[PDB]
Every structure is written in structure tokens, then in C-alpha cells.
Amino acid sequence: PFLDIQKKLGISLDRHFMFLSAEQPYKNAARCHAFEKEWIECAHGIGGTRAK
Amino acid sequence: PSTFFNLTMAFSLSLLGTLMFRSHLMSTLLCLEGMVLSLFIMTSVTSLNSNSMSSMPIPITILVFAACEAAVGLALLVKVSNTYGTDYVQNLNLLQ
Amino acid sequence: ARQWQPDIEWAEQFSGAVMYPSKETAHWKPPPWNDVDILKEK
Amino acid sequence: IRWTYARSANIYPNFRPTPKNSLLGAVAGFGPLIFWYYVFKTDRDRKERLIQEGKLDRKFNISY
Amino acid sequence: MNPITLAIIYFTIFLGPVITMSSTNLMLMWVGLEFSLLAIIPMLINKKNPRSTEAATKYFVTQATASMIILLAIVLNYKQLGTWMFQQQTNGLILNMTLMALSMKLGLAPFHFWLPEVTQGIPLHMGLILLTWQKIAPLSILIQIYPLLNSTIILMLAITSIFMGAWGGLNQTQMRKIMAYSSIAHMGWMLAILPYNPSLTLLNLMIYIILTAPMFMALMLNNSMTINSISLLWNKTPAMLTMISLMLLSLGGLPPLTGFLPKWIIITELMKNNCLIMATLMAMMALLNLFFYTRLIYSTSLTMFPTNNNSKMMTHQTKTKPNLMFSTLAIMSTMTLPLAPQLI
Amino acid sequence: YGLLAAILGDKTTKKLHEYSRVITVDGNICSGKNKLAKEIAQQLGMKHYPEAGIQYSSTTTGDGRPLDIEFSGSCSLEKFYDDPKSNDGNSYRLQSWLYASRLLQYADALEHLLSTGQGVVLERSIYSDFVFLEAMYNQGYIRKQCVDHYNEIKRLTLPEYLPPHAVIYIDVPVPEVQSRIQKKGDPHEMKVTSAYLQDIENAYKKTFLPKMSEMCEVLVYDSWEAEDPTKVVEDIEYLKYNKGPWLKQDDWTFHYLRMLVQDKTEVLNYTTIPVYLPEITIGAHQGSRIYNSFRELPGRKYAPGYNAEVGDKWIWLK
Amino acid sequence: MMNGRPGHEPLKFLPDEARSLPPPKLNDPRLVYMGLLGYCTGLMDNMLRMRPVMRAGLHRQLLFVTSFVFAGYFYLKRQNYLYAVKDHDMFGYIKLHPEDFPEKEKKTYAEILEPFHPVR
Amino acid sequence: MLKIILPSLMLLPLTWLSSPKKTWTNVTSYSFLISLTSLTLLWQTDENYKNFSNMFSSDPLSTPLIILTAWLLPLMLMASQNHLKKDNNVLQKLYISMLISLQILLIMTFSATELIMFYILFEATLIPTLIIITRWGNQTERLNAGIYFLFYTLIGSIPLLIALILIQNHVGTLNLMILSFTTHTLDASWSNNLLWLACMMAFLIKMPLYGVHLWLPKAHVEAPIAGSMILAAILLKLGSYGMIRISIILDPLTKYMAYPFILLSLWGMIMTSSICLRQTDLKSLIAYSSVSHMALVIASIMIQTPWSFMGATMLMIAHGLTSSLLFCLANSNYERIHSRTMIMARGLQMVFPLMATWWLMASLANLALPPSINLMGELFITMSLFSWSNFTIILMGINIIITGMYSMYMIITTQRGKLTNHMINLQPSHTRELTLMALHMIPLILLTTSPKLITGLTM
Amino acid sequence: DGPEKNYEKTLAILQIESEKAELRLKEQEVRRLMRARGDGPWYQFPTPEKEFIDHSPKATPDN
Amino acid sequence: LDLIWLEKTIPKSTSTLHTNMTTLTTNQKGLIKLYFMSFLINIILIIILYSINL
Numbered sequence A: 001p002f003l004d005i006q007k008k009l010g011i012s013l014d015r016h017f018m019f020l021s022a023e024q025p026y027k028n029a030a031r032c033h034a035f036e037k038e039w040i041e042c043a044h045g046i047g048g049t050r051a052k
Numbered sequence B: 001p002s003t004f005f006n007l008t009m010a011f012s013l014s015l016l017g018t019l020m021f022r023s024h025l026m027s028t029l030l031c032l033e034g035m036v037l038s039l040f041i042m043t044s045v046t047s048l049n050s051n052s053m054s055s056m057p058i059p060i061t062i063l064v065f066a067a068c069e070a071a072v073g074l075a076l077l078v079k080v081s082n083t084y085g086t087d088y089v090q091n092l093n094l095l096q
Numbered sequence C: 001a002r003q004w005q006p007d008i009e010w011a012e013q014f015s016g017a018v019m020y021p022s023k024e025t026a027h028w029k030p031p032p033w034n035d036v037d038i039l040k041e042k
Numbered sequence D: 001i002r003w004t005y006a007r008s009a010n011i012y013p014n015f016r017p018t019p020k021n022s023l024l025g026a027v028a029g030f031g032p033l034i035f036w037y038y039v040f041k042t043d044r045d046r047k048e049r050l051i052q053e054g055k056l057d058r059k060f061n062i063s064y
Numbered sequence E: 001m002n003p004i005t006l007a008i009i010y011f012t013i014f015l016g017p018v019i020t021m022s023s024t025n026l027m028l029m030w031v032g033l034e035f036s037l038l039a040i041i042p043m044l045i046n047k048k049n050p051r052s053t054e055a056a057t058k059y060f061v062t063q064a065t066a067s068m069i070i071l072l073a074i075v076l077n078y079k080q081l082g083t084w085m086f087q088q089q090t091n092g093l094i095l096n097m098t099l100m101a102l103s104m105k106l107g108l109a110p111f112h113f114w115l116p117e118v119t120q121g122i123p124l125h126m127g128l129i130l131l132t133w134q135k136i137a138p139l140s141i142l143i144q145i146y147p148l149l150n151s152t153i154i155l156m157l158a159i160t161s162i163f164m165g166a167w168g169g170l171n172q173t174q175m176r177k178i179m180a181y182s183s184i185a186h187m188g189w190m191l192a193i194l195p196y197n198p199s200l201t202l203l204n205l206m207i208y209i210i211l212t213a214p215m216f217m218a219l220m221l222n223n224s225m226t227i228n229s230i231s232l233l234w235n236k237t238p239a240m241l242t243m244i245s246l247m248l249l250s251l252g253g254l255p256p257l258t259g260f261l262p263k264w265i266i267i268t269e270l271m272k273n274n275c276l277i278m279a280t281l282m283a284m285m286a287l288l289n290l291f292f293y294t295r296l297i298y299s300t301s302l303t304m305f306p307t308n309n310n311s312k313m314m315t316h317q318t319k320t321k322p323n324l325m326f327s328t329l330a331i332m333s334t335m336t337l338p339l340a341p342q343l344i
Numbered sequence F: 001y002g003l004l005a006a007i008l009g010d011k012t013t014k015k016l017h018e019y020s021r022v023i024t025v026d027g028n029i030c031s032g033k034n035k036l037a038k039e040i041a042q043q044l045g046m047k048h049y050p051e052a053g054i055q056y057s058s059t060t061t062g063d064g065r066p067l068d069i070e071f072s073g074s075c076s077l078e079k080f081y082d083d084p085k086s087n088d089g090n091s092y093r094l095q096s097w098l099y100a101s102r103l104l105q106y107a108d109a110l111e112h113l114l115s116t117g118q119g120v121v122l123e124r125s126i127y128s129d130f131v132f133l134e135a136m137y138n139q140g141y142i143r144k145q146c147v148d149h150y151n152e153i154k155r156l157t158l159p160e161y162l163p164p165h166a167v168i169y170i171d172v173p174v175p176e177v178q179s180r181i182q183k184k185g186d187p188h189e190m191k192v193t194s195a196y197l198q199d200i201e202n203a204y205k206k207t208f209l210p211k212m213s214e215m216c217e218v219l220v221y222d223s224w225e226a227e228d229p230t231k232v233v234e235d236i237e238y239l240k241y242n243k244g245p246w247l248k249q250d251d252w253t254f255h256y257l258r259m260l261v262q263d264k265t266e267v268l269n270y271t272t273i274p275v276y277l278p279e280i281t282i283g284a285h286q287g288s289r290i291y292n293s294f295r296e297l298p299g300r301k302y303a304p305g306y307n308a309e310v311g312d313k314w315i316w317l318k
Numbered sequence G: 001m002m003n004g005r006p007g008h009e010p011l012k013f014l015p016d017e018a019r020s021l022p023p024p025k026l027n028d029p030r031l032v033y034m035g036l037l038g039y040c041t042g043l044m045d046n047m048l049r050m051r052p053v054m055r056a057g058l059h060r061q062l063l064f065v066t067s068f069v070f071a072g073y074f075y076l077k078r079q080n081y082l083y084a085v086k087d088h089d090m091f092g093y094i095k096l097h098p099e100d101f102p103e104k105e106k107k108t109y110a111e112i113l114e115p116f117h118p119v120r
Numbered sequence H: 001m002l003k004i005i006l007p008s009l010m011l012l013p014l015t016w017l018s019s020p021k022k023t024w025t026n027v028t029s030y031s032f033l034i035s036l037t038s039l040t041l042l043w044q045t046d047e048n049y050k051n052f053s054n055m056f057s058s059d060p061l062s063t064p065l066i067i068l069t070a071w072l073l074p075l076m077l078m079a080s081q082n083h084l085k086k087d088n089n090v091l092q093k094l095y096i097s098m099l100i101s102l103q104i105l106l107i108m109t110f111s112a113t114e115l116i117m118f119y120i121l122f123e124a125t126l127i128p129t130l131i132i133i134t135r136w137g138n139q140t141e142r143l144n145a146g147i148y149f150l151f152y153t154l155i156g157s158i159p160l161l162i163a164l165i166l167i168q169n170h171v172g173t174l175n176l177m178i179l180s181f182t183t184h185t186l187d188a189s190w191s192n193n194l195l196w197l198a199c200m201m202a203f204l205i206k207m208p209l210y211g212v213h214l215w216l217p218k219a220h221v222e223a224p225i226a227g228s229m230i231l232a233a234i235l236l237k238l239g240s241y242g243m244i245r246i247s248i249i250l251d252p253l254t255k256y257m258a259y260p261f262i263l264l265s266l267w268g269m270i271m272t273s274s275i276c277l278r279q280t281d282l283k284s285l286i287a288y289s290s291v292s293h294m295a296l297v298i299a300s301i302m303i304q305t306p307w308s309f310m311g312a313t314m315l316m317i318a319h320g321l322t323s324s325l326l327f328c329l330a331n332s333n334y335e336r337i338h339s340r341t342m343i344m345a346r347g348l349q350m351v352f353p354l355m356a357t358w359w360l361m362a363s364l365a366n367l368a369l370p371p372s373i374n375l376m377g378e379l380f381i382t383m384s385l386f387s388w389s390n391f392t393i394i395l396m397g398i399n400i401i402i403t404g405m406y407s408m409y410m411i412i413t414t415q416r417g418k419l420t421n422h423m424i425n426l427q428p429s430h431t432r433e434l435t436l437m438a439l440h441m442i443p444l445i446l447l448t449t450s451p452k453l454i455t456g457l458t459m
Numbered sequence I: 001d002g003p004e005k006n007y008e009k010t011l012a013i014l015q016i017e018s019e020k021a022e023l024r025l026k027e028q029e030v031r032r033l034m035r036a037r038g039d040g041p042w043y044q045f046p047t048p049e050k051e052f053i054d055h056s057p058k059a060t061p062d063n
Numbered sequence J: 001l002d003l004i005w006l007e008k009t010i011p012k013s014t015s016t017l018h019t020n021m022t023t024l025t026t027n028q029k030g031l032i033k034l035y036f037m038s039f040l041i042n043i044i045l046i047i048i049l050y051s052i053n054l
């Protein structure tokens, strides 16, 4: 974000849980898990202006 | 669904409240809280029907921060009816 | 003679809680220097 | 000293915009300023037309 | 303050903006905002004077409702996109809420009423923190979300702030409130270029911080909250009269000094983006800000106001010095203009 | 002295002892309080501060040689007496400078008390200055606003400083003082209208004494008890320092008070408030000249330690 | 803007790629300015603290003139890189998307009829 | 051109470092030589403009001024050694430095290739000037005068800032060289009709036009002599220099967008000239003389005929020198008299024989006596104006008759008539006062011998 | 030194200024294109990172 | 035309115009209720500004 002290430090205290398809407790997938993946592996390397 | 529009309007009705004081600081500090309940209920509701368990931490973090927030708010309130003998807002007009 | 340095009266205007005093605004009075109002016995 | 102050620093503190003062305060600033415009425009336009049509001699005029 | 408490509070007032900036999960950005709200309130009432309790109770209510509105935006997004963070798809109303809310915490435009009043009842010191280390947090949140916010609203809040700040300042004679009003104005320029070139917002802020921090440590060196009070600067400490003069004209946009660059490049960027309507009106009333800056100049430097005999007594005693920061932040601010290209 | 020092020891709490108190002795223009003071001081080793003077601040700062009158605010107690209700108002300017001088003295006293731990006898104090102004307004000496300006300065600065622990007091009826004046002859001091002396004591009796009675220990002494420092000293050692605001001064509270008195420029910050009553006003042209001239005195043109005139050295590395 | 670029170093000051660029000459007018900017800070400090302006803190004067300058070389070293990235980025695009930036060919004046507005 | 500038900067170190007693001579002696280095720019054996380097250039229009800007700093520092000799030794070294920075900044502004370099330096000159006028101004009203001088220039300035950034986007560089050799032809839209006004208005304001000239009478009245010399000799001409270099672009619109100003100026020339006829303050009369003789210039930088331009260049340099001379002698009367009133102090020639000769020559320069560059200048603007419309001679003909009347009235009621009975006795003339004058007129005599150097870009 | 030096110096000054001018304008066109096209390194706004998508086998089947 | 008409129109008028603005804009009760509702009005207008330009 504004100051990426997280990527730099390598820590991931705030990224592991930002979307539904992220690791769910006890490996219990959340609903919609079939699409968000398909909609973020698509928009990866393509910026937003062209993720839209 | 509609359930969400009721909660959202509850937050707006609570919004209209905090933004229109009626001579009672306590009442406001009480309206303010009405929002936090509406936010807590809405966050919990969607997290629950999205089966998004990774996010349930938030519904509570919201309450924990909101409680202290209110603690600070009430200490200011007690401070005011110690300096002016009332919580009435009109008294708070020295900074003009 | 000597460059006119401001007299007391020139200074006076800058006192008062508002520079350009209004109709009702002028009725106000400058804030206490100590930042603590005399207030009341309460 | 009472004379100079009365004549250059006691004027605007004693100005009240009336008629006979603003009518006369506009005829003086814009009156001739509009008069000469139709004096200079008409001449400059007469000149230009004549130059365009080919009549103005502009002889031995190698300067401007 | 039990020095331990001082540490906990100060840490929070400092962990508050830093969490906001570092995190991406908006939620964590909200609590960063929440911690700043909780940490600042204790310091605000340190004198505990009757004016102070009023200040904090206003600051807190204004800050709290805005905090709740920012949370509502995050809660709504969570339903419109499972993500906990604004995305291209975000409903426009969702973002506009965040603008209004964040423009209340920062105190821009039609929500500019709380700042002048809280700046009036808090000490000069806590005044600085309330003006400059509490603007970093919300602005971070906006700068991160710039691609998505509305160009129209920002501009309206921008222009309004410039006007309100300027007009408000003209009448004020209390210094704390003159600064509060200036901050509203500068904050306006900053939010004007956010939609177009966020990187310039971060310049129009730093320069504001490098200008305001010296200006306030100047006001408190003699702890003068009145212009009449700062006007007798010539007797209390004569040297700061020179730089106080340039820093205030620098705060306004006059060309040789560092203060022109933020306005100049913001105008260059807005014209590059074609807002030659908006930019023009902003620059024009920006000129109103210098009028009240120079009126203070008059009282403090160009003209010597009469002083009190008891002042001779304060001269005798050695004047506690101004920290080094004053100098390093006065010069880097009054004259860096020859080095603008690198700054931008 | 700062939080750093305080954090690591340097606590006023560890430096206080029974003999450590702020004791002021107040009386009429000639109560022999000067004598009682020195003795009480000699008794408990208390640093005896002399009554505040026009040049007390100059003796306080830098060289300590007495300053020229105009440098010290152009105040004459001498002129106070020979020309009461003067056109220029030297009497009010004298009183305002006197209040600033005791503000410096009281603050210097508190700094010695919290640092050394030794107590302090300050004779008259900011707390006992109002009686002169009350009598002056009761007389034609000062006008009503003049009074308001002093009261405003008093309300702004005096509350911050802690109250006198006890306020030893002497009393000697107006006839006594006038007679006492005759013994030390001075044309000026001599011509003090009795009624004015009447008004000074009246204030202590009525206003100052009971005022402080509730706040601090009050020991009133008849002239006879006086001139017997031993007995008075005995009584001080006898009173119990309980009632008063001093009870709540925890170490973490003293630190801030110390850092105030440690900064003279603040102690009298509100003494220079920009209230423009005519007597107080320097005036820019006169004030600028007096400044260029006070600031050019040797050792004053630069901060202590940096002016070479008086023999300071090492300036190029300081 | 330039953030989001491929390879961006998330928190680094000046990526090693900036090694390729020439180092700023220590006497670059700018670094020399920073020096003077610094000396003045020093002198100003002495003044505000009421010390002999030039003859005091000759150690500090050095810290200042030498702190500012130190800062410069390492800042300019970066700002120089940032600008250099800007070209690498800009020029590249002009090519990768050539059609959008087409090399036009102007006509010589002999062909261009430019209007003449007679002053007269 | 960094010898006309770097050595100048170094003056500042010398005013500060030097002894309090010797500060005046080091500064004045050195800038006299600084003027001598300035004379090297005059060596232009060829037509090509001398582009010293990327940012710094000097063409025929700037060169005649850079030398005047360098020349007056010596004189300004010699005219203000009296007042400002009652100061504390650190107020002086500030005034001397302020004067030094004005020509450093003004030398660069007149010698600047990039138009926005002109703007930044252009509007910076206000800082030094406002300090000189407000800080040392004798009258109670200088705070007001300073405000007028800052706002009229500033409100004009921000439109120019927007306009120049605008052309940079439209053309792609604000470099005066390129802008000249590139096709920038405005298209007579309604908007362009605004651009033109944006660029010219800021220059038209500091070059007092009839509509916005109230700032100059108020400013010179309370300004100290050095500030009044700078405002009349170099500061006002900054506006003219700007109009010459900025109208290279906006080429088509001024053909028809100038009428408003031209008429404002020529009618303005008559009224400003006339009110000089009955104004009691001498400094007031010289200031309105300055407005009228500068109203002629905005009416030649707008007709835009070769002769106008160099008529303008001739008059600007000439009137600059003459006005100062008048403002400098006005001060000498003011310091002994202690009042600006023209009616007092009558008969001075009887008591100050020479200053009166300087007064006479200054007045003859003020009115157009013929073997003077002042007349050549007006004769040329007059010619072109006549070409624009033969009727112009009527208005430029009422001004000549009025200009003769007020110029001689200043001599007749100040330097002739019976002596004032007993004002504070008027001490004799110092040699500084007389030289400060001689230094103004000896160059006026020398330039009139070879007018070619100050003829402008056009010829 | 001569007429040669200024003529050749002025041409060098013009080439630097002409080339700087062409580039400044091209920047404005490139920057217009990448903002809208988003097909160039500048103006590449972020979207979530696939480095967190959990591709593990979930106990809950069918997803 | 000099002095009054050319000083009342350009230099003085602009002096008067803005002072009125500050006076009207800066004459505030200082009471929170008033100020806050103004926040209410703002939210309403901005809600609309988005709505109508949807």
C-alpha cells in the first residue's frame, strides 16, 4: 500500500485473508470459491484498467 | 437481501441521529453505539451467508475497538458534567 | 521625521476575537490569555 | 498641512455616491474614451479599406 | 503524565498512522484511524482547562462518526465484492462515502468547522500534531484509493476548502486559528490533485509539514497565540523575525520561496489534465491567503508594534533556545526552490 | 533538568526534609521583617532571599552589576513617594516591575527548593504584593483599570506556582511604622501618607492574612514576638505543615513545576501580555533604543558563555 | 505513476539498476547548493540561539555543510535514477506502440502558406 | 552573463562581512566596476543575439537595460546613505543587500531566455521592493502602499502564470528563442482573445496603464528614495520588457485586441499629464509624469511598428534615467525641507545655485528638448501613432503642451520666485547629492551622442 | 573570440531546447495513452495477488 | 475620475467585496449543533451530485 513495510519485511500479517478464496479454517472452502479464483488469476499481471 | 437494507437504513437513521443533537450528550453517545450494532450485525450477517469464516475475526474486532471508543466518549461526557453540571451540548460553546 | 512606527491605536484593531467585527460578532470578547476561562463558582 | 490633508487624504472619507456624481463620474471616464474609439476605428477602417481597394498612395513611404 | 502513560499514548498516536499506511486490508486501515482517535484525545486535554474539554468532545464526536462512516464503506464493500478492500468494480456511492468521511477526519471543505475550533483550544504543541501527523493517516487511505475516487467531488471539496480557508483566515486574529484555517486551505490543494497525480499530493503535504512545523515552534518559542503577541517578537527574540517573515510568505504562494513549487506543479498537472477552469479559480483565491499572511507580516516584522516595559525583564533572562529543527526546517523550507526538479 | 533526569532519579521527592518549606514574612513598609527573615534563615539554614528590587533581575542575570534605570524598566520607589499620582505613572510601572521581580524571585526560590532541597524564606511574595496596589487604588495613586491589569497578570501567573507553606507575619500599628521610618531617615521613604500605610496593613489584616490562613500556615506576630527570632523560629518549627495544596505534589507532579521555574522566560511569560495600558507600554521607538542599548552591554550581546567581552572563551567550538 | 512498474523494489531506496547511471559529480552545482543551503542552516541556528554568527560552532558548521551534502549525493543519485527510469519507460512505449506515435513529416515553407496579417 | 551576476551576488557577502564604517564604500565602489563589466555585453559586432548559455541571453532590448540596472545600484546606494545613516548597523547592511538583490534579480529577469524564468524572477522583485517601501517608508500609509503594490501586481501575475504554462502545453517550451522561430499563431477565438489579455495584463499593470496606475502614485509617495528610483527606473520597465518578448506569440490578436488599451493609454496620457498640473506633492507630480510618459510606451508596444518599438526602447532607458534624476533631487529638497509640499521651498536657486542647474536639465529632459534621446523617443512613437491614425496627433498633441507646462512649473515654483523666509535654514549641498545627480545626467548626455545603442530590437 | 563562437553556441542551445521540447510533448501523449490503455508500465493499478488464492484440496467437495 | 471613481471601482471595491464574505462566512455561533447540521446538508448535496450525474 502507501508504505509497503510488509512486502519488504516479507511478513504477511494482512494479506493472507483479503478474499473469500483464501485459506479457510480446517480447509472448509467458503462459498463462491469457484469464481474469485478464476477472477483473480485472470487479473494478475494485467492491471486494473484492463482487469475491468 | 432486504434484511440488509433494513440494517443499512437503521445505520442511516442512526446517522441522522448523531448528526442532529438534542441537548443530550449521553443520548448521542448512545446513538453512536446504535450504528456500531448495525455495522456489527451487517458484518456478521454477510460473513455468515458467505460462509467466510476467515473474516469472523472482524465482526468482533469491530466491537472491541468500538467499546473503547465509547469508553473514551463517556469519560469526555463525565468530564463535561463535572465542569458544567450537565451533559447539555449548548454549554459546549466556548470555542466560538 | 522618523518613520512612523505604529501607535497604540493602530495596535488596538488587532485585538478582539475577530479582525473585521460583525454586527453580533463584535459583541464577543477576546479569549482569555491563560486559555482558562474565569467561568463560575459552579 | 490642514490644506494638503483636506485635498489628498480627506477626500475618500467624505465620498458619498450620489447622482450628479456617478453620471458625471462615468461621462468623464468612458465618454471620450468611447468618443475617440469611433474616431480611431472609423479612420483606421477608412485607411484599411482604401489600402485594400488600392487607392492609398503610400508613396515614398518606406518607413513606419 | 506518568512517563509510562506518555509512552503508551505517544506510541499509539504513532502506531496509529503507521498501521494505516502499512496495511492493505482496509479493516486494519480503519483501526489505524481508530487508534489515532483514541491516542490524541488524552493529550488534547492536558491543561484540562474548560476550553479543552470542549475541544476534545468536539474533535471526538466529529472523528467518531466519520470513523463509523468509513467502517460502513468497508462493510458495504465486503458485500459487493467479497474482498475487504476497494476495487475497480466498487459502487460509486461506496467510494464517495469514503471521501466524505475521510474529508471530515482531515477536515476539508464543508466539514471544516471542527478543526478551527479544536485548533483554538489545544496547546500549540498538540496543535501541530493535530494538524500534521494526523493528516498523514487519512491521506494515505485516500492516496491508495485515488484511482477510484470521483474527480468531481474532490474538486468541489478542494475549491470549497480553498475558499473557506482563505475567507476564514482573513477575519481571524488568533494565531492558532489562522493556522487551522491555512491548513484547511493547503489541505484543499492536496486533495485537488489526488485524482490526477497522487505523487504531488505527497509533495504538497511534506512542504506544508516542513512549513507549518517551523511556523508553530516559532509561535510557541514566545508562546504567542495572538498577532499582537507575535508582533512584540522584535523585543522578545529579534532573529526569528527574518525567517518568520519568509516562512509565512512561503506558506502562501509567492515565487522565489519553496512554497511556490507545490502550487506551481499542481497547476501544471491540472492544466496538463485540462482543468484550467478549476485551477484558475483556486490560484486566484490562493492569493487571498497571502493577504492575511502579509497582514501578520506587517504586525510582526515590517512594522514595530509598541511593547511593554515588563518585556525588558524577559529580555534580561536567557531565552530558552529554539530546537535545531527550527533552522533545518526553516531553510529547507524557505529556500529549496532552486532544487525543485529533484523534489518532484 | 528534564524528564530524562527525572526518569533517572533527580526526584524532588528524595530531596525534601522537614526544614524544607516556602516561608514568607510579610509586614508594613517597616516591619523589621528584614531582620526576622535573616534569622529564621540562619536557624534552619534556609536560603534567605532578599526582598525583590528594581535591579533584582539584573543581579539575577549575567554580571549581576546593577542595571541603569531605563534598562531596568525606569522604575523609582523614590519618585513613587515624592510624586504620587504622577503624570507618567512611575508608581504603577514601579509596582508592575516589582511583581515581575518577585515572580522571578519566587520562581528562583522554588528552583532552589526542588533541586537542593533546602527551604526558602522569601520575605514578601507575589502573594503579598496586592496590598500595595489595593492601598494605591484606595488612594489616588492608581486608577481602576491599572488595578485590573495587575489583577489579570496575577490571575494568569500566580496560580501555577505552589502556595507559601506558611506565611510568618509581623504587625506594628501605623504609628509604629511611621516612627520607625523616622529612625532610618530618607527623604523619600519619609513622605509616605499614613492613610496609604493604613491601606497596606488593612489589606494584609483583612485580605491577605485570612486568605492564606485557609491555604497555608499563618503565624502572626506582634512586634514584641518579633525581634525575638528565636521564639518565632521556634513556633515555625512547631506548626504542622498539613493544610494546603502542597499535599498533592507527587514527584511526577513536581517535575513539571520544576521545569517551569527552570525556565525564567516562561515564569514571566504572562507578565508581558499584550494589554496596552498606557503606563506599561514601552513604545516602539523608545523600546527599540533601550533594547539596542541593553543588548549591547558587555556579556549580553550574546548568550551566556558566548560573549568574549567579559572573558568567555572556546566560542569557536561551543 | 511509476509505481506498479515491473520489478519495482517494494521498499528500496535506489535499486542496483541505478548503478548503470553515472554517479553525481561531487561538485555538481546542486550538491554544492545543498552545501550552501547547509552552511546557512548552521549560520541561522547560531543566530537564532544568539551566538557569534560565524565564529561559533565551527564544529557544527561542518556537521551541517557535511550532512546536507552527504544527503545530496545519495538523494540526487536516486532522483537521477528515477528520471532515468522515466525515459527507459517512456522511450520504450513509443516503440512498443509505434503506430500511436508516428513520425510525421512536415512540409517545407516553400509549400506551407502561412497567413500574413499586415501590421500597417 | 554570470559576471554581471556572480560578482553581483558576491556583493552580498561584502555588505555583510565588511566593517560597519567601511561597508558603504566597498559596496558602492565595487558595483561601479560591476557596471563596467556590464558594458562588455554592448560589444555586438553582429546581429545574432548573444545567447551566453541555455538559461541566460542578452539581445539588443535587454542589453540597454541590464547596464542601467547595474548602473543604478551604485547610485541607489549613494542616494540612501543619508537617510539610512541613522540606522543600527544591521539595518543598513539589510537595506544595502536588498538594493543589491534587486539588480541581481532584475539583471537576470532582463537577461532571461525562458519566459517563466522571467515570471519567477519577475514577481520575486516585489519581495525586495515591498521590504524597501514598507520597512523604511517614512509615512503612516506605506503599509497601505505596500498592499496596493503587492496585490495589483499579484492579481495580474497569476493569470500570466496560467497563460505561460498554457502555451508550454500548446507549443512545448517557453524558450524565447524557439517560441520566436516557431509557428504560434493564435486563432482569434473568444478564448484566445482571453489568452492575449492574460499575458499582457500582468505586464500592463506594473507598466501603469490609465485604468490600473493608482498603485504607482501611492507607492512612490511613501517609498524611500532608493525604492522610488528602482520603481521608476527599472521596476516599471520590467512590464515593457515583458510586453516586447511575450507578443512574439499572440501575433494575430493584438492587431484588433489592442484598441481598448491604446485608447485607454492615449486618453490616459492626457489626464495623467494634466493632474500633474495641480498636484501639491512633488513626488506625486513626478509619479504621474511617469504614468503619462509610460502610457506612451504601452501605445507603442501595441501599435507594433518598427519605429514604435525603438521609440519605446529609446524612451524607456531615457525616461528611466530622467525620472530617477527628478526623484533624486525631489528627495534632496525633501530632506532639508522635511515636507513633500511643492508650494514651500520657493526660490532655491537663490540658495542652492547648482542643484538648480541639475533641476533645469532634468526638466528639459522631462519635456522634449530636441538634442536629447527623450525627444527622439517621443518623436518616433509620435510618428507611428500618427501612422496608426492621423488623428492620434491631437491626443499626443495635448500631452506635449501639458508636459511642457508641468515640467517647467516644477522648476518655476520649486527653483525660482522669492526665497522662503525662514524654513529651517537649508544647509548647503553635499557633494554626494550633486554627484548622484551628475551620475544620472552625464550618462544622459553621453547616450544622446550615440542613440544607436539603446535603439531596440527593431532597428 | 568571434562571430563563429556565438553562432555555433546558439545552434547548440537550440538543438538541446528543440529536442527537450519534442520529448516533453511526446511524454504527454504517451502518458495519455498508458493511462487509458493501461498497456504500459505506468498506470498499472493493482489487483489482488494470486499468491494467496488457496488452491489446496478442500474437504468440502465440489469446490 | 482619479482618487474616487478609479479608486472606488477597482481597488476599493475589491477590498469591500471579500470582507463581506469573511464576515458572513466567519460569523459562526460556535455551537456544535449548527455546525453539524451543515455537515448534514453537505452529505445530502453530495449524495445528489453523484445521483443526478449518476
Ligand SMILES: Nc1ncnc2c1ncn2[C@@H]1O[C@H](COP(=O)(O)OP(=O)(O)O)[C@@H](O)[C@H]1O
Binding pocket: F028, F029, F030, F031, F032, F033, F034, F035, F077, F080, F094, F095, F098, F132, F133, F189
Ligand atoms: N509595591 C510597592 N510600592 C512601593 N514601594 C514598595 C512596594 N513594595 C515594597 N516597597 C518598598 O520596600 C521598602 C521596604 O522597607 P525597608 O525598610 O527597606 O525594608 P522592610 O520593609 O523590611 O523594613 C519600602 O520603603 C517600600 O518603599
